[PDB]
From Swiss-Prot, chains A, B:
This is Lethal(3)malignant brain tumor-like protein 3. MBT repeats lie at residues 2-102, 110-209, 216-311. GO terms for cellular component: nucleolus; nucleoplasm; nucleus. The chain holds residues 231 to 545 of 780 of the full protein. One of its GO terms (biological process) is chromatin organization. It is found in: Nucleus. Its main location: nucleus. The lineage of its organism: Eukaryota, Metazoa, Chordata, Craniata, Vertebrata. It comes from the Eukaryota. Keywords: Chromatin regulator, Isopeptide bond, Metal-binding, Nucleus, Phosphoprotein, Repeat, Transcription, Transcription regulation, Ubl conjugation, Zinc, Zinc-finger. Is a negative regulator of Notch target genes expression, required for RBPJ-mediated transcriptional repression. It recruits KDM1A to Notch-responsive elements and promotes KDM1A-mediated H3K4me demethylation. Involved in the regulation of ubiquitin-dependent degradation of a set of methylated non-histone proteins, including SOX2, DNMT1 and E2F1. It acts as an adapter recruiting the CRL4-DCAF5 E3 ubiquitin ligase complex to methylated target proteins. Required for normal maturation of myeloid progenitor cells. Interacts with RNF2. Interacts (via SAM domain) with SAMD1 (via SAM domain); the interaction mediates L3MBTL3 binding to chromatin. Interacts with RBPJ; the interaction is required for L3MBTL3 localization to chromatin and is impaired by Notch-derived peptides containing the intracellular domain (NICD). Interacts (via SAM domain) with KDM1A. Interacts with DCAF5. Interacts with DNMT1. Interacts with E2F1. Interacts with SOX2. Interacts with SFMBT1. One of its GO terms (molecular function) is identical protein binding.
Amino acid sequence: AWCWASYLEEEKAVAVPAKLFKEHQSFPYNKNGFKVGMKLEGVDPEHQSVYCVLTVAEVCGYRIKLHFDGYSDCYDFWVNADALDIHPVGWCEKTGHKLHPPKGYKEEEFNWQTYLKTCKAQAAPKSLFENQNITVIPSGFRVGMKLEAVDKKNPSFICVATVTDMVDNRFLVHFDNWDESYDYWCEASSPHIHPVGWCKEHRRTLITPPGYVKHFSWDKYLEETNSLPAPARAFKVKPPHGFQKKMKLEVVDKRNPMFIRVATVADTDDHRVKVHFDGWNNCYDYWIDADSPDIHPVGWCSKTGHPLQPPLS
Amino acid sequence: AWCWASYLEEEKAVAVPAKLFKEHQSFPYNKNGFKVGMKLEGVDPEHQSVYCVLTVAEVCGYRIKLHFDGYSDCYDFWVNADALDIHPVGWCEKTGHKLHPPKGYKEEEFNWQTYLKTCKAQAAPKSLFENQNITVIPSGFRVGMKLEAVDKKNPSFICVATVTDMVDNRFLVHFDNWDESYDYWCEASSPHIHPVGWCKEHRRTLITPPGYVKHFSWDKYLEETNSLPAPARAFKVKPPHGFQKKMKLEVVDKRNPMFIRVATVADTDDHRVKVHFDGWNNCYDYWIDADSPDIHPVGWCSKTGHPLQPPLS
Ligand SMILES: [Co+2]
Ligand SMILES: [Co+2]
Ligand SMILES: [Co+2]
Ligand SMILES: [Co+2]
Ligand SMILES: [Co+2]
Ligand SMILES: [Co+2]
Ligand SMILES: [Co+2]
Ligand SMILES: [Co+2]
Ligand SMILES: [Co+2]
Ligand SMILES: [Co+2]
């Protein structure tokens, strides 16, 4: 019978200290009020500019598995009870964002009120959303501003981007003249964004928009698109995460995300940790942002009622 | 007879745009009120924690050559009329900083009033100091806070440092357990400073203080020295400078600093430009911070009454 106490002893090891985990990573303040069958609205994680109709398909401790109504279960995904890119039924209508209805339906005709009755289902209550009354820190970022952004789907490339929306303390990065498939949400301290002129001065090759870098001028482009660059003072410095090699923690199995496993910090860089699942081969290691809501301190699973997968026997 | 107009034409070249130069680099707002013989107080540029008695030895356009009273002329140095690390007679006494008197004198016995009469000289008036009433931007930096700083004298090395003083919007970086010879003044956006934990996560080797990195803990050290780390949010992002290769500008000859020469941006990095003096061999090129008060737009010398050395014949 395995426990963290004796495991730390035998292994002569140490946990990543609790104080290094941020609010969404650490022990939650409250219970998981979500119930299977509850419906809500959510950003499609692979199409981050798109809002979708979602149902809680499963609940596990402080986490929920969400399902795209009327679509295949292969798209299902797990987030914690306090996730940021989920909203209550009605939020899209309230804020004027476009809501993708379930499969078979027309966007115009969809009507939550009738849909909830048909499905004999309740919407998750508004109290559950940790994002209903977020304290808005002042920011230099505004919709329309341009900048230089890593393509998260191809992180080798830095590209011309624009802020196309803002919600609470987050904003949506969109790559000019590309499909919205590559959009992503981040904040002002993101290590994946830089002011215009960054690439040139760091000897990196800026990917310019399709239909247009050996000539490209930011100035000409800003002028022709009647746009402003995000001011440099708007960007913030990402605090060092302080995670060290060999420290222990609990982390979601990216590949079988129903599980959380005992893990070790194998490696570290300026904004990522390389996680190793104890007892597994090293080819199951992987890199994840050190601020990720899917890594947690020792004890998280216990305190929140989620099973911890012990080290592979 | 050489002029910038015809030189730009013949060379088929372009000036660095005026708008890229910062306030201390660009055309000044007022004349140079300094006069030879005027006395003042100044930071010793090679010992930046030390204040010294200085005399204006020469005036050229908007610049002044300053002399350390009673010491060798080899120490003389040039700054612009609006320099930051010069202060009026009496400033050290006003602010409680230690003033190094001229050679031969005792620090305690030195007395500006009697010294000015003996030398039959006037102190530069307080109006001349662009630093007398500087608008103080709010900052997270406070005296005592620790951080990681490049050694500017050996910029290969990042080392453990502390903020040991603050004046207007600048602060003094001091390397723990080293001589003060390595101190230097900077601001919150300096590319030479980073929060604690930076080095470890960027695969750099932090130089720890003498008398103490394969074991070093920032936490233990902060605790034992009863000190706080400068918060990450206090650091700011250095705006890209926008200087491009082949662009023309005017710049001080670092090696014979009485002269300002026609120059070309030869190379660029994240915070520096490599200047080339037109007509000279490439072995006279050198690197300088792109925010340096010694590089200026085409026309600076004309408008301020400083001679421009044309391209070497
Ligand atoms: Co569709
Ligand atoms: Co577009
Ligand atoms: Co797709
Ligand atoms: Co990254
Ligand atoms: Co970094
Ligand atoms: Co002395
Ligand atoms: Co010291
Ligand atoms: Co010395
Ligand atoms: Co440097
Ligand atoms: Co940089």
